[PDB]
Amino acid sequence: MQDRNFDDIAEKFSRNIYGTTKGQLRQAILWQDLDRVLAEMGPQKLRVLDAGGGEGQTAIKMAERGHQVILCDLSAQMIDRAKQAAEAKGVSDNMQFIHCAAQDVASHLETPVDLILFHAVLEWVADPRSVLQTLWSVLRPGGVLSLMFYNAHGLLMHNMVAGNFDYVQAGMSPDYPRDPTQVYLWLEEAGWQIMGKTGVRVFHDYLREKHQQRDCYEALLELETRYCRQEPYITLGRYIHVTARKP
Amino acid sequence: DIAEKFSRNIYGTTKGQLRQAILWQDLDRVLAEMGPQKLRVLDAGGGEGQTAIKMAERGHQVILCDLSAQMIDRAKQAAEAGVSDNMQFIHCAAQDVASHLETPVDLILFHAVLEWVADPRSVLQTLWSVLRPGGVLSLMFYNAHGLLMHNMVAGNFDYVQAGMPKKLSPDYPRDPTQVYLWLEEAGWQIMGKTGVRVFHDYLREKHQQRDCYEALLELETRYCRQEPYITLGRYIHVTARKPQ
Numbered sequence: 001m002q003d004r005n006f007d008d009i010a011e012k013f014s015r016n017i018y019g020t021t022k023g024q025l026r027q028a029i030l031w032q033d034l035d036r037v038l039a040e041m042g043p044q045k046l047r048v049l050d051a052g053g054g055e056g057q058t059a060i061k062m063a064e065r066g067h068q069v070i071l072c073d074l075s076a077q078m079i080d081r082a083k084q085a086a087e088a089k090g091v092s093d094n095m096q097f098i099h100c101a102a103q104d105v106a107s108h109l110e111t112p113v114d115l116i117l118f119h120a121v122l123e124w125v126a127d128p129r130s131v132l133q134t135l136w137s138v139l140r141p142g143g144v145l146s147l148m149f150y151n152a153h154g155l156l157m158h159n160m161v162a163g164n165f166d167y168v169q170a171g172m173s174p175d176y177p178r179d180p181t182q183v184y185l186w187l188e189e190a191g192w193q194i195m196g197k198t199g200v201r202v203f204h205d206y207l208r209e210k211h212q213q214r215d216c217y218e219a220l221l222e223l224e225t226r227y228c229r230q231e232p233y234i235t236l237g238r239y240i241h242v243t244a245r246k247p
Numbered sequence: 248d249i250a251e252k253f254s255r256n257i258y259g260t261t262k263g264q265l266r267q268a269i270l271w272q273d274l275d276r277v278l279a280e281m282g283p284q285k286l287r288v289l290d291a292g293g294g295e296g297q298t299a300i301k302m303a304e305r306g307h308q309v310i311l312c313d314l315s316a317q318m319i320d321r322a323k324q325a326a327e328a329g330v331s332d333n334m335q336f337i338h339c340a341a342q343d344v345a346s347h348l349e350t351p352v353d354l355i356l357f358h359a360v361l362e363w364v365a366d367p368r369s370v371l372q373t374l375w376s377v378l379r380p381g382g383v384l385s386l387m388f389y390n391a392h393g394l395l396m397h398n399m400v401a402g403n404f405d406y407v408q409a410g411m412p413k414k415l416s417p418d419y420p421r422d423p424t425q426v427y428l429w430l431e432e433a434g435w436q437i438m439g440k441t442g443v444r445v446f447h448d449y450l451r452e453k454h455q456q457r458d459c460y461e462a463l464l465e466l467e468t469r470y471c472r473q474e475p476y477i478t479l480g481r482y483i484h485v486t487a488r489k490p491q
């Protein structure tokens with residue numbers, strides 16, 4: 001074991017990360033892509049649907065940028081957690097909370113949307129093509145889909161690094177870890193045009209000394225940022241964030 | 248334990264044993280596809296001859312060339328220790344090998360050499376030039392991506408940040424996307440791509456390399472010929488054919 005005391009760490013004077021490093025890194029990389037696409041889409045405010053929004057962290061941040069956000073989730077508890085985190089951050093006036101399945105969201109919406117966030121939900125649905133078609137149908141032409149899905153290759157790599165050989169050998173963490181090649185095909189089949197692909201946590205989870213995730217977070221973030229949009233790193237991401245536009 | 252010592256060399260390293268096991272899965276596959284006849288095989292940059300010897304043990308005529316006089320001395324002395332009859336030695340650069348060959352060869356091994364040469368495209372062309380139409384090149388090169396991932400996993404962030412300047416350090420780890428292009432533009436037909444040590448070097452508990460060797464070998468064998476794993480190999484072994 002290595003002494004991690006304050007005096008030993010190169011990044012000792014950098015800010016600490018309040019939550020989890022897995023979450024902080026995920027947010028950072030995701031928002032690099034979201035800021036890049038938002039700047040592309042011009043200065044006008046958007047109508048954004050966050051389907052399967054959970055406790056609303058991303059949706060609340062989206063509401064902080066002025067947009068009207070519609071969060072949808074199957075869990076009533078997630079919705080109540082969301083409403084409260086939103087009130088706390090004084091953005092209750094810029095958000096909607098719909099308690100329903102993403103598959104049924106079209107009946108709860110009045111006009112189409114400009115941007116849809118479907119983050120970490122595709123691996124939880126048994127009907128992924130159908131959910132994608134629902135999303136495609138509530139999005140305006142020219143609109144964008146920000147799709148972040150749990151990558152089966154990341155799962156395998158994580159478990160091999162961790163020495164969980166019996167699991168990787170036998171199989172049977174979400175219900176349906178996805179094959180990136182099949183996800184891209186689903187998107188292209190429906191008619192979406194893929195703009196970008198980013199691996200989310202391409203190195204972080206695989207570090208031999210896990211303490212470095214926190215102790216060397218900034219240096220790690222710089223290298224994740226550098227390599228996360230190149231193969232093979234994209235395909236080694238724990239999640240893959242694909243941005244796609246409807247023509 | 249019991250079965251361990253009889254299936255690998257316990258005096259060797261797991262990195263070398265795994266590398267050899269995966270390489271030989273591919274070589275044995277190619278050798279079978281090339282028909283039952285015995286072959287003329289050139290091992291360009293064969294070093295101490297570990298692989299050239301295993302080839303000659305399979306009964307083929309093997310020709311080993313190497314720039315280093317010292318490597319050649321070890322190869323011959325290892326050959327005798329008793330396959331000296333199926334082998335020939337040449338002290339020269341692979342670039343200069345043609346003059347030293349009486350006739351063309353059937354199979355060329357160029358293992359762990361491409362990352363050391365300043366003229367990789369030229370050397371690949373020389374190898375093509377001494378190979379018969381329909382012959383095969385077995386190319387194993389040190390993979391830049393595997394180096395990067397190894398370093399990242401190990402926490403060597405400043406080294407990766409700096410671009411891994413050379414500081415057992417090949418001068419020129421290769422980009423597999425570029426190597427494939429080099430082969431294809433030169434007329435080779437790629438037959439197979441295999442990552443050599445796609446998990447082993449990245450295990451969090453390094454004791455598992457030895458303690459769970461056989462299980463690891465199985466998992467490596469299963470995933471090393473598909474992406475992204477190929478691209479994470481410490482080496483990549485590409486088999487390519489010179490068109491008939």
Ligand SMILES: C[S@@+](CC[C@H](N)C(=O)[O-])C[C@H]1O[C@@H](n2cnc3c(N)ncnc32)[C@H](O)[C@@H]1O
Pocket residue numbers: 051052053054055056058072073074075078100101102103119120121124125
């Ligand atoms: C792992 S979480 C991700 C939450 C959030 N989007 C995020 O990025 O942190 C998945 C969320 O999807 C919700 N969920 C699962 N299946 C769903 C579906 N078919 N429709 C809408 N929400 C779903 C869960 O209740 C959960 O809050």
Ligand SMILES: C[S@@+](CC[C@H](N)C(=O)[O-])C[C@H]1O[C@@H](n2cnc3c(N)ncnc32)[C@H](O)[C@@H]1O
Pocket residue numbers: 291292293294295297298312313314315318339340341342357358359360363364
């Ligand atoms: C790392 S070793 C690999 C030895 C062997 N092929 C193997 O797989 O273990 C590289 C070898 O290539 C030889 N070598 C390097 N450049 C060469 C060249 N241009 N022509 C011939 N041999 C070369 C070196 O002397 C060395 O023995």
